[PDB]
Amino acid sequence: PTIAHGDGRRPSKQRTFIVVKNCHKHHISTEMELSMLDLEILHSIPETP
Amino acid sequence: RRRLQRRIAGLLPPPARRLNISRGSEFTRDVRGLVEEHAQASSLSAAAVWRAGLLAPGEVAVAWSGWRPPVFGDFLIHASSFNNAEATGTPLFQFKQSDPFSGVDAVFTPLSLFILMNHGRGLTRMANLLYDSPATLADLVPDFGRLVADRRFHNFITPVGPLVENIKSTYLNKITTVVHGPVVSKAIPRSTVKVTVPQEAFVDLDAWLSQPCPADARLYVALTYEEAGPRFTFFQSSRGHCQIMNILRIYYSPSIMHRYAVVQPLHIEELTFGAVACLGTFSATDGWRRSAFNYRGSSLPVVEIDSFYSNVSDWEVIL
Amino acid sequence: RVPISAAVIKLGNHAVAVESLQKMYNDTQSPY
């Protein structure tokens, strides 16, 4: 909104701002390992205590 | 010996090489079990991990098939030495730095590899538009003039294959590249990746000659030594390495006598006319579809080799 | 009738009000 002046000025009309904001994209990651000795026994089925 | 039958039942059946379909409209579960390949990425739950079968040893199997998983080269580079506006599938070149311990390597796109050759003396407009200053690249090679002068620039640059992952860090960039194997992007929507080589640096060699059509048409990168500074050209051929050095000597036949006529090789080390190296294979049918690479200002033509199997080789000298 | 949102202080016998139009002027980007 604007204020109306009584004095002689070059007066401002109805201003309106259109502002946009864009998203960030953060790509978080790690790199864990798993030994092959602990994957062959995982996809097998034993019969021994 | 009865558990042996259960172990061999777990071990025997390969994926079906043939399957008698009746109609394509029915889409039976047998032909779905044929055509399905296990994935490589899934959500972080027990059901998704067990369904994609990532935990199977060696190769993926839910609870060998002619597919090889790729290997990834992990490279740390300075953020100034690389342009983050590069495409994904572009072949890079690690330069072997001369320090004993570095930590930070030095890679080069063929756009960035052009401006090491340009200074001291289209494609060059885009190259100078991407990287503003060559001096921030011409110190990565510490002694470029000597190394070009004694013709030992081919053994200090080894190819590394195309890029797949480029995180946009601020000081020290980490890029990932496929040094060997099936080039496929590591994105959560798994999208394909096309090896991009700029057009003026990529001259075809099948159509340069102008009937037995093979499948694997290799892509050869070629460093040559010119009086106008060295050049990095790219050659696509459907032939053997034995064929490729003969036909590349025939292709460079004017340039060798050009370099000989303007400069006499006064010493013994200036005889080598650079070297070549096989960058890997791709399909000879739908190879090298032409496309464009747009920066913010300009656009150069660039070839787009699709479905590349990267496989580097050592340098074979041209003479 | 309506509450007038303006703080009132006591100075002896008179209870004068204190109000700031700053916020009513900054939303027009004018010089106070």
Residue B56 and residue A43: Cβ atoms within 8 Å? yes
Determined by cryo-EM
* CA angle in degrees (0–180, nearest 5) for C15-C20-C21: 135
Identify which of B119, B121, B113 has the alpha carbon closest to the alpha carbon of residue B153. B113
Q: Specify the pairing of strand B231-237 against strand B216-224.
A: antiparallel
- Residues with Cβ within 8 Å of B106's Cβ and at least 6 positions away in sequence, in order, are B77, B78, B81, B94, B95, B97, B140, B141
d(CA C32, CA C25) in angstroms, rounded, equals 7
CB neighbours of residue B24 within 10 Å: 7
> A-side interface with B, Cβ within 8 Å?
27, 34, 36, 39-40, 42-43, 47
- Using a CB–CB cut-off of 8 Å, the residues of B that contact A are 3, 55-58, 61, 63, 167
Tell me, yes or no, whether chains C and A touch by having 3 or more C-beta pairs under 8 A. yes
Contact B311, B280 (CB under 8 A): yes
CB B165 within 8 A of CB B89: no
| B88 to A38, B92, B116, B204, C4: CA distances (angstroms) | 35, 11, 22, 22, 64
Query: Are the CB atoms for B232 and B157 separated by under 8 Å?
Result: no
Which candidate in B55, B84, B175 is best for mutational testing of the A interface (most A CBs within 10 A)? Answer: B55
| Coil/strand/helix, residue B73 | strand
Per DSSP, the residues of chain A read --PPPSS----------------------------THHHHTTTS-----
Rounded CA separation B276/B241 (Å)? 10
Q: For residue C27, which residues of chain A lie inside 8 Å, CB to CB?
A: 1
DSSP code, position B267: S
Two tokens, residue B318: 């041209």
Interface test with B, best of A27, A30, A33, A38 (most B CBs within 10 A): A27
d(CA A38, CA B285): 43
Whether residues A1 and C30 touch (CB distance < 8 A) is answered with no
Which helix (H) or strand (E) element contains residue C22?
A: helix C22-26
Residues 6+ apart with CB under 8 A from B319: B249, B271, B272, B273
Contacts of B58 in chain A (CB under 8 A): 36
Torsion, Cα B253 B274 B223 B77, to 10 degrees, reads -170
Q: Do B13 and B6 form a contact (C-beta atoms < 8 A)? A: no
**Measuring CA to CA, how many Å separate B208 from each of B202, B204, B235, B250?**
12, 6, 10, 11
Q: Give the C-alpha separation, B137 to B120, whole Å.
A: 13
User: CB atoms < 10 A from the CB of A14, how many?
Assistant: 6
Give the span between the Cα atoms of B293 and B303, in whole angstroms: 9
DSSP label of B221? E
Residue A43 distance to chain B (closest CA, Å): 7
d(CA B112, CA B91): 11
